[PDB]
C-alpha cells in the first residue's frame with residue numbers, strides 16, 4: 001500500500017506534484033494532497049508570480065479553477081510551444097498532476113529538498129516524497145478524504 005509523490009523546487013511557494021509517475025490525481029484528491037503539505041491549490045495570480053521567478057514544467061496540473069502548464073521556454077512537445085501559464089481548454093479526461101502553494105516557503109526559487117508531509121493524517125499507506133535529486137522522505141499515513149479517490 002504505497003504512494004510515490006514526485007515534487008519539485010518551490011518558486012514563490014508554488015511547486016508541482018506528480019503521483020505514481022503518471023497523471024492520476026482528481027481535483028478533489030489534489031486539494032487534499034496540497035492540504036497534507038500545509039498548502040492549497042495555487043491561484044492563477046500565485047502561479048503567474050511563480051512563473052516569473054523561474055517555474056516551468058512539461059506536465060498538466062490543477063490550480064484553483066483550471067488545469068495548466070507553466071512555460072518559460074518554447075518547446076514543441078510542452079503546451080504546444082506556448083510560453084506563459086498555458087491553460088488546458090479541451091480534454092475528455094479528468095485526472096492530472098497537481099500544483100500546490102505553500103505560503104511559508106521562500107519568496108523566489110527554493111531548490112532545497114522537501115523532507116516533511118506535515119499535515120497528513122493517520123492511515124495505512126506508505127507515502128514517499130521523491131525529490132528531483134532522488135532524496136526521499138517516507139511516512140505511514142493518509143491524505144485522501146474522499147472515498148471515491150481511494
Ligand SMILES: C[C@@H](NC(=O)C1C=CC=NC1=O)C1CC1
Pocket residue numbers: 010037038039102105113114115116117118
Ligand atoms: C510542507 C513543506 N515542507 C516543510 O515545511 C518542511 C519543514 C521542515 C523540514 N522539511 C520540510 O520539507 C513543503 C512545501 C515545501
Ligand SMILES: C[C@@H](NC(=O)C1C=CC=NC1=O)C1CC1
Pocket residue numbers: 112113114115
Ligand atoms: C527545518 C529545516 N527545513 C525547512 O524548513 C524546509 C522548508 C521547506 C522545504 N524544505 C525544508 O528543508 C531548516 C533547517 C533547514
